[PDB]
């Protein structure tokens, strides 16, 4: 059969994928962009409107002396120009880091406790739901107690809410299901079962505070606004005094001893709050992703779409804003989520395991990661080699280490069921692309490169972690492009083989998999499409506050 | 020699130990025993074995509800954890025959470590401890089972947690008094940032031996600050004396007074009388059926008015044997006093102050928690210079159990580990034989 | 002990609320079961609710300091800790939420006080509370118009009162009746109704409120014009201004 | 003259407003309300939508048993319900902040030093310019050098740019004057001159990032992406070799050894990085208020617009979001910018003070302190006290107590001219109320209130501060409500008094001096009712990228 | 002026920062001291030290 990639090729140029030469030099520059087009004539606009000239296409050198291709975006037929994968011009990837930031996950173990020794009052399905009632009204921005309050527009935070979800089914089962995350309904039923022993009697919320509230502040304020409206709820719904000393307990179990962040908080040259994407680790990111629970029977899709989870928001909001901005940083992550071709690779060494050892069934040592990384990074290399429409696609070198490593990676923890191996496979194939082209990735790709075979089985202070802990303030990886969302792959492919429910936090996991949430996390890359086309619709705006 | 000042010290029980001893032998600077906790704290860790191989066995790493699914691994540690132990104590010790301490504890299951003085003098800060016994006790473990290369990294995560992705030792299975130092509010704070509870928990909630625990890091960590140096280091030396040391049993002999039946005001009246009888006060105006107090030393107004502070809390929480109100006895003792003398109350305000905030996050919805959980680094209970946290220090060792997260809770392996330890136990006692011995030298 | 400074009479008043010695006017009588009605934390007949095993019970190793100081009743039984709340009418209530906490201090033994400025609370062990609060609404503390038990929903203390003299109260937990000219309780300090109301006696008149108030007012005794009490306050301030520079 | 506030109570109530009874429970709770039975039938609409209950009347207890009040916007004819000045239903208060959160000062000193040193180029107002030009294409996410780059549409950043200024009059008038903000024509003269003579020949950029961008990511991203983009600029318009040795001076130039934040980080529990409310110093925010160049013949106003612009800022956006959250702190904060209260007592106080000193003629000591502070306690609690109407508005103590001793502080401050006697002021004005009424503010409400007398004039570590320098994260404010918006107020009131152009930053005052800024930094009252009349329009919407 | 804080200082500190600490109360009390800077006026003393710190 065709390569995967062979459609995307085809789209974009006028020769077939294998021809070696091209004319350049006679499209226009900009003028053959329907985009660019756009925005020099925005740019005029902008610049009359404001007295202040700004975007300008003869300013600098001049684009599109070559072609400015579109990219599919892969597992759909959506063909875009790159432009509207910017995380700037996509609505979707917006929304995705959104309902990221604005959840967390609070415990109401410790809460039911207070409740049933402290006061000495009772808990039911009844009183939760009566508590969960009480809490959708207050978590958005409204009062339960106090006269005189003034309260959020409902319309302008129709995104927040509360669910709960637990592992006992009789309670589950009894609560109003408005409130509940079915975890029978949402998974199927072998990893149902795992998740529900996870869980056990534990009784979670899954908090999502409104978009514009996080868009005007920050991460680290998902957890204090969920907090207050729990503690507004626990003193409405259980007719507690407004203010007591147990009323501490409430605050101190929401806000720390039964809280989960989706990130933890940044060291002071990066300082960041809490749920910001640098303290997402990695075997979060998997979870958050939810094609596990729908694309079981292949494990090469799940670990692909985690990679376009992950390939987006590390490489293209996080490190291509937060830590950097301007232009950023979107092809550098287009690479790991478009034309199939990232897909392409992983498939090809997911069969040589699957045929050679038998997923999951390869020894977890250097002679699986010595064979199947180099045989997948030789694949990958040689089809840039035999299709030099390929090459022009993923152009520069980064790109293409990013890609062929995440294949090598993800197949060597496919044969292994184990990710620290798939990391060494990692590292291995970005050797051998070295000594193979004599060229890798930009002036500073191999940082964590050269560093990486020997910080893999380290077990020193700040070297020695297991691939699903790491995330992008492991030391080595807090820098650079090409790296985190692919390593996010590389965590979700031994699961995915062994068919885990989950890589890192089953709470983390079954928190995403709710079609309450604006972005669906069962179809990142098609959601992406979608945000591309100006057709995904995001919470937080302000239209109904402003004038028409 | 710098101050006139001398005190008597008495023990817990309220006997005589030593007359006249000078206020500078209890200094920080100069006591011994202050040095010897202080270097002790900074370099005790305590390790749960038995948590490391429960993590390790169901491969729950990295933090809570955390697992990594196939990364299982079944070592018997508890079952080897003298040989462990002893090959972890090899790699922590500078030489064969110095202060490196390795006690296994609970049938192995807990150690005891305290890592040498020595590597502490060479380093900048405290983070010794937890690093140099986290991977002795790594490669001790790895090395006992031949842990392989492929799976060694699961005992690291066990042991430490998600260190480096965290910056705290997030999921680890050790467990310091001490906290890292990106926590510190400000420079200078590391000996604030302990936990109330692992205070009370260390000192087995001897009501005595907690408060001086407390006051002896409270005090130590405002000379680290500069607090405590020039126009402010008498004041704060009287602090520790009158309110940490019980000084010329004035907190010991104001709740034997008061004990029986009395109140927060009760206390203030019998604290008045005795600076007055002291000298330490005196009427500097009469108004309408009101006597204006003034005095010439603010310093020992200030520690007199700490004493009775300290007694208010001893009475007002022991008589409910429940913690929650020393918030209200902080700010109350203060604001009464002040309107009873004229004169300012303790800390100048400071620590009326942070009972206000104190109580509020105690009994709201915003943050805070129960008094166990606050320290000196706390942003709700930093202000004071160390004239507030030991009271509630005191007020926890008094609770009867109405506390959610209480000592039990939060701090049962400190419990296990630094009560051990005499010095940190029964500070008190060694503090004062320092002071003693040391007497004539100052 | 001096208490409070000044020569008004609600300076006066301020430091007879805190003086143990004063004897607090009882105006009006409350049954003991209507006691524990209002405060809501039990049904009359219900055995207390522990939070820890009776003291006695215990094996508690030896501490000079708990052997000094006498157990609350409610601390030896081991009880839960409950409380009582009220909100004060800046229109001349009787007490106001700084005279209680004050007071509460010098009064009552084992007390957590709050105070705030729409509501004033006391926690302490249930069985000593019950008895406390007896006092507390028995007595000139307490004008069942001008002062409310609440333990939510407390706005009031600065609204203008009604066509009664009552305070507002968002879940009307006190009622005038113009038939008697008293006042009842007819919810729970939490705001849940009560089987049967409970009798607060009538309201105090203007002349008396007057008499008893420990709120300084442009329309009363103007905490301007008693000068000795402002002495000290600006005393205090200067005090602590200059010990925080350099301990002069 | 009537007091100031006495239209606005005529406005809430029937009464008179020295009428002491009035009638309740008889205006239907919420349906009293147009804006609550707006929010009723739109939590209907909500819940039915998406399936889960939400905002609902009669959760909890009944709204409205009293007046719901409008307020008067102070200094304007402006009244609306309270909820109309929530932050999140608010656009002008939204965009107030993204404009602070997405500017940075960056000189050009050491990069001009650079390029003439170490490229061994010429600068000119010329080349200047034409790097401004480079700039302001590139700042907003546009390329200058590489071949197949994609770009942020620039309608979705219009918002974004650069400005320079310059002390030198005559270099600023050769610099195209689209880029430049001119001291001359925005600043009086004697305060121009000020202003120049602390810039000299300094020359500074103004940069503006992306609001869009800035609600995505956070205040810590500002700094980097100008940076970026300023890097970019310099290849492009100077003609370097795009990235040498020389390009990481202009690197470490632009994110560090010349850039000034509008705040700075926060220490881990309330972890945050730069550009983030708590980090903004009082003496700052006063200077970014542009009420100093307008109003400058009426220090009251110029000090009450600062108390305007950080009571929203840090009660109601920071303290009410970013450090907790839900319903949050509306009027904690709209007491010390509504129905001209505070304007009556601050004018009362500043009378006082000029008739028996003159301003800036007291001497600076604890004397004028109690004199002053004690007076101006005495009148606001009077007023109080005679218009039981006021009382019943501003019904909570800590907003009576902010109130009331804003009022005694700064007009100690104008006896004085001096902002740590002002503050000494303040604290008096607290300790007073509490005797006078037995009551100041919620439960929490005077920790720094207590500490304050005794820290006022403290050198110690972390006591000791002017007050200017002073801010949210000074230890002793870093928690509470109705004091930090204020606390900016007496920082800005002696400078004010002494027509002072700035209080702690000349470069921080000119930087906001822009009328390409969204928000309207002259006239903050102003603008927040704009917004509450859903009358502004922000930047950093999405429209343009999702449907119609 | 070259100061070293003495090692005393460390030996029962948790961490280094004794010495800026020490350093600059030292100074900003003796600066005070030799002129008798007002308590009005010796805050600035304390910033021109060590700078904006608390708030930074
Ligand atoms: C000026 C630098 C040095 C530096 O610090 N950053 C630059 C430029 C910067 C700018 C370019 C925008 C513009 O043109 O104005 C941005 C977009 C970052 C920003 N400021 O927004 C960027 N690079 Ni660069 N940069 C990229 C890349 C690369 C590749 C391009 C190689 C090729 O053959 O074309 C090379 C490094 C390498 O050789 O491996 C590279 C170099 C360089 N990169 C050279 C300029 C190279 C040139 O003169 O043409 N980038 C890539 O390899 C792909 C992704 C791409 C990024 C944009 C996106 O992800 O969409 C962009 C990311
Ligand atoms: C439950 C608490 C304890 C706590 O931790 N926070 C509360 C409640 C909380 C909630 C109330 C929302 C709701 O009703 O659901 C919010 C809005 C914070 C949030 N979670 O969004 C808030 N307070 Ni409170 N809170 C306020 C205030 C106050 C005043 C109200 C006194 C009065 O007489 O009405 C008193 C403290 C005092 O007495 O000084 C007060 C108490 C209390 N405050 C008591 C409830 C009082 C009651 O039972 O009625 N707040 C104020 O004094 C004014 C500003 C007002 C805040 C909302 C705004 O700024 O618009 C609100 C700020
Ligand atoms: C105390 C502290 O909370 P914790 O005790 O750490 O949970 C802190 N909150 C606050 O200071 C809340 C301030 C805003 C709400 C109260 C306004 S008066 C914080 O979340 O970092
Ligand atoms: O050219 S560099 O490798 O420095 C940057 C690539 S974006
Ligand atoms: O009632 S509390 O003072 O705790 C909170 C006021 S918003
Ligand atoms: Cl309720
Ligand atoms: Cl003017
Ligand atoms: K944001
Ligand atoms: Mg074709
Ligand atoms: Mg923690
Ligand atoms: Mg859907
Ligand atoms: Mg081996
Ligand atoms: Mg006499
Ligand atoms: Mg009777
Ligand atoms: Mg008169
Ligand atoms: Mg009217
Ligand atoms: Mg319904
Ligand atoms: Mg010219
Ligand atoms: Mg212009
Ligand atoms: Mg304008
Ligand atoms: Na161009
Ligand atoms: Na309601």
Known sequence: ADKLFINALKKKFEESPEEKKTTFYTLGGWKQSERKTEFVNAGKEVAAKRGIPQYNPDIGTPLGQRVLMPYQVSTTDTYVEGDDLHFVNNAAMQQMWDDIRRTVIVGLNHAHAVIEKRLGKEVTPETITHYLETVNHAMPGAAV????????????????????????????????????????????????????????????????????????????????????????????????????????????????????????????????????????????????????????????????????????????????????????????????????????????????????????????????????????????????????????????????????????????????????????????????????????????????????????????????????????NYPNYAMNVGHQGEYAGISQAPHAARGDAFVFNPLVKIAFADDNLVFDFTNVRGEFAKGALREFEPAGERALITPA | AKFEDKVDLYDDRGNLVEEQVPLEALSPLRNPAIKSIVQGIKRTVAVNLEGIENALKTAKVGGPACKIMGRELDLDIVGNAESIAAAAKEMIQVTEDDDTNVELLGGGKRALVQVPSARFDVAAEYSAAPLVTATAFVQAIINEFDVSMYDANMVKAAVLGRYPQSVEYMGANIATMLDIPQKLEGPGYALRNIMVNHVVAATLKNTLQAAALSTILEQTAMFEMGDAVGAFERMHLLGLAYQGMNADNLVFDLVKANGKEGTVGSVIADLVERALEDGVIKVEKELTDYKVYGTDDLAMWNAYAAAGLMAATMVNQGAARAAQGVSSTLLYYNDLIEFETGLPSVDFGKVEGTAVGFSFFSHSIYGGGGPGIFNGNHIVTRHSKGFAIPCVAAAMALDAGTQMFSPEATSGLIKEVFSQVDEFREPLKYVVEAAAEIKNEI | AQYYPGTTKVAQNRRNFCNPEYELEKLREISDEDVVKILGHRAPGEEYPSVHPPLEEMDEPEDAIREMVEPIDGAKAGDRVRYIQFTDSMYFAPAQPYVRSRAYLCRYRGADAGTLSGRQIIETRERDLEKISKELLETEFFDPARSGVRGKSVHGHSLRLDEDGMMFDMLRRQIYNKDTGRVEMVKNQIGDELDEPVDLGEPLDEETLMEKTTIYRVDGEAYRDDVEAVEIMQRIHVLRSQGGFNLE
Chains 1, 4 share one sequence.
């Open chain 1, 145 to 472: 107690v106090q006269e005189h309050m003034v309260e959020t527009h409902p319309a302008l935070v129709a995104d927040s809410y509360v669910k709960v979800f637990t592992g006992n089914d009789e309670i589950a089962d009894e609560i109003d299901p408005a409130f509940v995350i079915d975890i029978n309904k949402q998974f199927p039923e072998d990893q149902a079962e795992t998740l529900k022993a996870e869980v056990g009697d534990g009784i979670w919320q899954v908090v999502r505070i409104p978009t514009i509230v996080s868009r005007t502040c920050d991460g680290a304020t998902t957890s204090r606004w969920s907090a207050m409206q729990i503690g507004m709820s626990m003193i409405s719904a259980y007719k507690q005094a407004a203010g007591e000393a147990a009323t501490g307990d409430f605050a101190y179990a929401a806000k720390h001893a039964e809280v989960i962040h989706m990130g933890t908080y940044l060291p002071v040259r990066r300082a960041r709050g809490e749920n910001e994407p640098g303290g997402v680790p990695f075997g979060y990111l998997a979870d958050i992703c939810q094609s596990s629970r729908v694309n079981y029977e292949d494990p090469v899709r799940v670990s692909l779409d985690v990679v376009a989870t992950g390939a987006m928001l590390y490489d293209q909001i996080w490190l291509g804003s937060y830590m950097s901005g301007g232009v950023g940083f979107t092809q550098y992550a287009t690479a790991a989520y478009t034309d199939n071709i990232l897909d392409d690779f992983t498939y090809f060494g997911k069969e040589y395991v699957e045929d050679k050892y038998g997923l999951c069934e390869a020894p977890n040592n250097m002679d699986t990661v010595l064979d199947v990384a180099t045989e997948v990074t030789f694949y990958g290399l040689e089809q840039y080699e035999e299709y030099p429409a390929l090459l022009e696609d993923q152009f520069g070198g980064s790109q293409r280490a990013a890609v062929v490593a995440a294949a090598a990676g993800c197949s060597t923890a496919f044969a292994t069921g184990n990710a620290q191996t798939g990391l060494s496979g990692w590292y291995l194939s970005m050797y051998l692309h070295k000594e193979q082209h004599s060229r890798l990735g930009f002036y500073g790709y191999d940082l964590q490169d050269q560093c990486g075979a020997s910080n893999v089985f380290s077990i020193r202070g700040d070297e020695g972690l297991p691939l699903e802990l790491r995330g992008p």
